[PDB]
Write a structure and sequence with these properties.
2 domains; two-stranded antiparallel sheet; binds zinc ion; E3 ubiquitin-protein ligase CHFR; monomer; mainly alpha
């Protein structure tokens, strides 16, 4: 497959197939990788970076897929910045929608909580990463820290787990009584019925599955 990118030399440019009519520079043995987000080609220098950290990262350190943003800046509609240290990752203005169990009702309660106190999702992530670093909050990708270079999707995933733990350590008296009144769902946070408006509103799903 023939490949011409932003850092490709000018002779590669002119050699490509013509369209149909009605400080790097990639070497001959230079490969290209495809940014997972924007779909465009960049020179694949990941193996070189392995013994030359002077090279900008070109992959998420969790999923291990490649991304251009840190290398030379990505651009696409919906791309907030697809690679960053976790603590600086741009999660987008809508990162709190369904952030709790993909459950809008629960998410909204969290939203009101933060609005009421003038807190942003950034403030909340900042507190959360501090709990994480102490071992007070936990992650599935258990080795992730605020300094991890990762992607939009991976950061978001871990963001939801931190957020859940944040919501969890809010005291009942700091929430409206309409919220606290609701009884726990027997099936807890993983309940499948909570994506139906009526049920989400009727039961509290910030809880664990009932056993005994
Ligand atoms: Zn190139
Ligand atoms: Zn990733
Ligand atoms: Zn890109
Ligand atoms: Zn991107
Ligand atoms: Zn339920």
């Amino acid at each position: 497959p023939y490949v011409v990118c932003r850092q490709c030399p000018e002779y590669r440019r002119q050699a490509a197939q013509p369209p149909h009519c009605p400080d790097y520079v990639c070497p001959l043995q230079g490969s290209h990788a495809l940014c997972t987000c924007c779909f465009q080609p960049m020179p694949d220098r990941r193996v070189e970076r392995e013994q030359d950290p002077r090279v900008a990262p070109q992959q998420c350190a969790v999923c291990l897929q490649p991304f251009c943003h840190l290398y030379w800046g990505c651009t696409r509609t919906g791309c907030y910045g697809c690679l960053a240290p976790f603590c600086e990752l741009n999660l987008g203005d809508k990162c709190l929608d369904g952030v709790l169990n993909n459950n809008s009702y629960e998410s909204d309660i969290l939203k009101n909580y933060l609005a009421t106190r003038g807190l942003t999702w950034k403030n909340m992530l900042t507190e959360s990463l501090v709990a994480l670093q102490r071992g007070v909050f936990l992650l599935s990708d258990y080795r992730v820290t605020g300094d991890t270079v990762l992607c939009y999707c991976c950061g978001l995933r871990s963001f939801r787990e931190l957020t859940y733990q944040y919501r969890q350590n809010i005291p009942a008296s700091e929430l409206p009584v309409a919220v606290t009144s609701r009884p726990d769902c027997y099936w807890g946070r993983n309940c499948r019925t909570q994506v139906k408006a009526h049920h989400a509103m009727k039961f509290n799903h910030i809880c664990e599955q009932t056993r005994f």
